[PDB]
Amino acid sequence: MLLEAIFHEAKGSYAYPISETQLRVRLRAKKGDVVRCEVLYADRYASPEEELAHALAGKAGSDERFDYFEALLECSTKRVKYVFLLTGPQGEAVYFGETGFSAERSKAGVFQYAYIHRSEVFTTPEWAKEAVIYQIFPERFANGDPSNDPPGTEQWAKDARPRHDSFYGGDLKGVIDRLPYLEELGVTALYFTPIFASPSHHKYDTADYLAIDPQFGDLPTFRRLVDEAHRRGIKIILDAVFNHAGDQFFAFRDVLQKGEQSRYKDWFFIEDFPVSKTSRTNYETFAVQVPAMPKLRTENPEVKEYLFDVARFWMEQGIDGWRLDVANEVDHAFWREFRRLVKSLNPDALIVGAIWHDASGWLMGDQFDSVMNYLFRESVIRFFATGEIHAERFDAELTRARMLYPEQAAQGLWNLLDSHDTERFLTSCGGNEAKFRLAVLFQMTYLGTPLIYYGDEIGMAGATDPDCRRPMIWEEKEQNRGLFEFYKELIRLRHRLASLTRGNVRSWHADKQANLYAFVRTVQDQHVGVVLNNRGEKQTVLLQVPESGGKTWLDCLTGEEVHGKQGQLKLTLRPYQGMILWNGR
Amino acid sequence: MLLEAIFHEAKGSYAYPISETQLRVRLRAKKGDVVRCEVLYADRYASPEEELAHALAGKAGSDERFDYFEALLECSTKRVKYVFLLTGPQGEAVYFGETGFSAERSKAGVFQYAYIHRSEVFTTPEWAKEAVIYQIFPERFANGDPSNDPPGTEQWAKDARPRHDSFYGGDLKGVIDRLPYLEELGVTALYFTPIFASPSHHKYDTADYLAIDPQFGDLPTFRRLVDEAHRRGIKIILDAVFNHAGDQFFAFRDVLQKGEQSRYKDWFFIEDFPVSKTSRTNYETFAVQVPAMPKLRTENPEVKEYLFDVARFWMEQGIDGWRLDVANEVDHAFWREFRRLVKSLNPDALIVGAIWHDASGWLMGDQFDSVMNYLFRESVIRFFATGEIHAERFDAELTRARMLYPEQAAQGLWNLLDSHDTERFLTSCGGNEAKFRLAVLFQMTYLGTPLIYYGDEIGMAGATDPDCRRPMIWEEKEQNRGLFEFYKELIRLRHRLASLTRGNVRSWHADKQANLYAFVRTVQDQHVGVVLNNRGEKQTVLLQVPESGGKTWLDCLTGEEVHGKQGQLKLTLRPYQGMILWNGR
Ligand SMILES: OC[C@H]1O[C@@H]2O[C@H]3[C@H](O)[C@@H](O)[C@@H](O[C@H]4[C@H](O)[C@@H](O)[C@@H](O[C@H]5[C@H](O)[C@@H](O)[C@@H](O[C@H]6[C@H](O)[C@@H](O)[C@@H](O[C@H]7[C@H](O)[C@@H](O)[C@@H](O[C@H]8[C@H](O)[C@@H](O)[C@@H](O[C@H]1[C@H](O)[C@H]2O)O[C@@H]8CO)O[C@@H]7CO)O[C@@H]6CO)O[C@@H]5CO)O[C@@H]4CO)O[C@@H]3CO
Ligand SMILES: OC[C@H]1O[C@@H]2O[C@H]3[C@H](O)[C@@H](O)[C@@H](O[C@H]4[C@H](O)[C@@H](O)[C@@H](O[C@H]5[C@H](O)[C@@H](O)[C@@H](O[C@H]6[C@H](O)[C@@H](O)[C@@H](O[C@H]7[C@H](O)[C@@H](O)[C@@H](O[C@H]8[C@H](O)[C@@H](O)[C@@H](O[C@H]1[C@H](O)[C@H]2O)O[C@@H]8CO)O[C@@H]7CO)O[C@@H]6CO)O[C@@H]5CO)O[C@@H]4CO)O[C@@H]3CO
């Protein structure tokens, strides 16, 4: 067994409390060397002469290089010391604990989880566990009052291909008008890109953080929205740009005019004094040459409490959660006090983050509830749209990703197909709607949160910025009603089959040749299976049972396939068919 | 190269700012697998036209199974994305990064440290980095004035063997009368175990957290000690137990007497109503049957502030530093708002934890500055006292422990050789003053802060609680002043030799058989190498020269070793000799 490959930390994504009294320890080994891992543990003071309690660590997934095992250690005493007895394939047993490896128990040492306090059990809003979000880019979703329109609006048409700045006017009233659509699809929260008052077509140059931008609406319209949507099941989540300010911020203007005398001077990172906002962008901004975005000093206790009052206004207004823009470039202490502030104004206001590098520093329990799952985006483009990885690599990428984070985070990362910065996922499959559908049949059953972009329930293609941002096609003859009844089908299925939302994922079948991949999602007795054929030709496959039991297994999209031959469930599936097979339990 | 053994993270101990412009990055690798390690880096938002800057990661030492590479990335924009070019023994060029491993750069991805903040550069009290702390267990240091006493006391001579009941007097005025000793020895801080009012001889069931124990002193004798010591550059660091409270304590009294009526019911977890002092003792405890100490539920806002009010108060008294006992079972929120407090009251207040399992989750820079280094306590017990580990395992335990936490946390850890509950180091050393002297030459040059116990300067031998709490031996005639002048000289070297306090430690020779281990301390051109023949015989060893250079070294304990024979430096050293060779620059 090569022991420099076995890994565990008593911190972090490898040990964490699911409850006061229940601890979760995970361990990884090179693919194949550990064939049995079993935790032996006791309270942190229990005297030697006692036999230990025991709990077997299951295999929870194997990515490309490592096999990942996971066990559940009851700690009634809310304190736990433990060692792993690891067992090889050729039978070698070893013991792993803090001292190192040994084959003689004690000299392994012992790992320890100091105390488990309920304030450190990572707790995320129960609602977000079964949600499906709908990303609204408000400017392109609908224009419901023509009076707000910026001058020069282009005509709304399925014709449109935009340019960078080009406005189409789309506004909070429009959304208010189209809420009886959103509601039928079965969405449960809308996530607006930034709506606040700002100079450009995209509101990232924030000018006043405390008011809806002039082209979108006004606080009573935002309330009428918050209120009309909540009453329809839908929550409202806002985009929070606290990293950097815009050029028309008060404090950026005060430093601009007064310079060194303004009581705002230290709010921003200063070499360009006086402010040259036109010729030398060297004053800490977004990145070295953007001259209209200077960074707010989140460290400063005035800056901090301003953005906390920004955060409280918007929550007086009724919102259920923020998505945090460029979260990773504002300090952890801000994000902690932020979590403290938010979660007290609203027990269920979610705080979700955007960082596109490993985000575990924030998914520890104390800063955000989940981040945007970029790794699912990469995996789904490649497997489903470009073809470039095969089900084995699919499984590897999937599997390496979910063990990034505590399961409280993983189970609710926002699983996005595309965004207002990417080419649109139908362009990604180059127009092929069988690929697109399979990628959605995946999205709606995997672990985390379906995030639909505006437009894809009805078929919109596009390139990256600005071409994803074409107006939404709202005429029922111009919309792929085929797709819509599928999103509504799947969405319904996500909402009744408790395991799809709240259940764990285990890999069932990964066949690089035929390109099928199939998973099970499980809560208690229930098992649903998702068999996905990523082939444009039709395949039988044979597969083995899920552990417990199922002689008979319904298909929820279509009817019975009780083919459980005592261990072989045999199933044919036509091109790009996914099947979602439910225990019946 | 086993790829499963390569580790790096962009958090924690494996990457962290040393300044806002500079990020230390560390990488762990199976021993022997990797020969050159190098970090190639650019700013996060840098475009691909640019060459990546290069930075070579030297071998920072190798523990039993792993080598460790460590590099320094000058990141001017405070943002860094980095790919490692690993280079191995046959010549395999591997690229490591977040995406994974590939022989092509782009398929490896890049790790990211998003932005580096002044608030997140771990800062430590600058005195503490040179300090030599003197451990007093007050009750036995000396007796000042017998109006302290608690009727029962026993005699002040060498002969007297403490039983667990006893009191020998021992009080803060003795320590005042004793400071010119402390000033002569050369210590720079004094850390007193608990002195707060309590009903027992272990004051850890602190009964009155706001007042010194009757038997020890009063607030002006304390506050006179604090002054009289500042005058001699000796600082008071004090043991605080915020984990459990005492039975007799004010806020608890109110449920001994008040049942549910008790406002203070929620400061405490209470299993079994009421206080079962006598019936059976299970109620949230330090341990399994320990009877006076129920858990201070620090999580509670109304507790927390009290335990912050204690700390305001003892800091109004002018104390410099807390050592916080059984720290590991109180919440990271307590610790972290406590650190903000202490450091805002006094920017220089040392804050030191006591965890006896890996404590990295408090050694980030938001929580404490160091723990008690129990590894040092056991790694010297083996190499020096017991003879049960040779030079190559001493080197390995040392390196496996000094790569565990960020560097700032590692140069202030308390290097104790014994405590009031352990055996006295001469008694482990077997009484051999020659073995002991060598383990002190080491503690005084090793990375960390030297903790002297009261009495080891004078050769006090002793055993577990009680024998190690024996009175100090104050008669010149019964003191090993031969030891006292040796400790006195090392504490002087450490304070004149920059690298002994603030440099880094690279092992120079570790030879299993000869049992001679040797190391180098370094800051800028200055190198100071300590050669230790830990073998009872006189060997001659030939060391290879260190990186800046040194054709000629002076030995600080005795005179000139110009043995620099074209790289080789020949040293003939006597039994149990440690040399301290200062490279002259
Ligand atoms: O006031 C309490 C006490 O707090 C401090 O103790 C800290 C100590 O300084 C640190 O070193 C550390 O302790 C950890 C220790 O290092 C580890 O080795 C391990 O401890 C285990 C023991 O090694 C193991 O032997 C066993 O314990 C059983 C004992 O063997 C057995 O003798 C008996 O224990 C009783 C003692 O005999 C008795 O004397 C008593 O202790 C009183 C002390 O004498 C007195 O000085 C004082 O101690 C302070 C101490 O000065 C601080 O350093 O009060 C004590 C109580 O009034 O009581 C013991 C019964 O509880 O029974 C035990 C168990 O049946 O197992 C342990 C656990 O595996 O882990 C230690 C825990 O971290 O940290 C502690 C603070 O946590
Ligand atoms: O206002 C800024 C911006 O904020 C938001 O963007 C956030 C986004 O949601 C996060 O995902 C993230 O960004 C990371 C990004 O996702 C990664 O892809 C990577 O990005 C790299 C690109 O993949 C790579 O192609 C290249 O980028 C070069 C471009 O190819 C090149 O064209 C040029 O980019 C210019 C744009 O073309 C131009 O349109 C303009 O961008 C403006 C947008 O059009 C406008 O919508 C808005 O942008 C918001 C965005 O909507 C939010 O979602 O403002 C933009 C600026 O005014 O100007 C660009 C300037 O050159 O140059 C780039 C090289 O810089 O490289 C990148 C990086 O290597 O990594 C990203 C960082 O990890 O964070 C952003 C917020 O920071």
Swiss-Prot record, chains A, B:
Lineage, top-rank taxon, reads Bacteria
Q: What is its EC number?
A: 3.2.1.135
Report residues binding substrate.
H244, R323, H420, D421, D465, R469
GO MF terms held by the record = metal ion binding; neopullulanase activity
Enumerate the UniProt keywords alphabetically.
Calcium, Carbohydrate metabolism, Glycosidase, Hydrolase, Metal-binding
Bound cofactor: record note? Binds 1 Ca(2+) ion per subunit.
Indicate yes or no for the key word Lipid metabolism.
Answer: no
Quote the catalytic residue positions. Answer: D325 (nucleophile), A354 (proton donor)
Give a yes or no for keyword Metal-binding in this entry.
Answer: yes
Q: What catalytic activity is recorded?
A: Hydrolysis of pullulan to panose (6-alpha-D-glucosylmaltose)
The record lists the membrane-crossing segments as none
Kindly list the positions annotated as binding Ca(2+): N143, D145, N148, D149, G169, D171
Cofactor(s) required, per the database record: Ca(2+)
Q: Which GO terms describe its biological process?
A: carbohydrate metabolic process
Q: Name the family.
A: Belongs to the glycosyl hydrolase 13 family.
What function is annotated for this protein? Hydrolyzes pullulan efficiently but only a small amount of starch. Endohydrolysis of 1,4-alpha-glucosidic linkages in pullulan to form panose. Also cleaves (1-6)-alpha-glucosidic linkages to form maltotriose.
Query: Whom does it interact with, and what assembly results?
Result: Monomer.
What is the name of the protein in this document? Neopullulanase 2
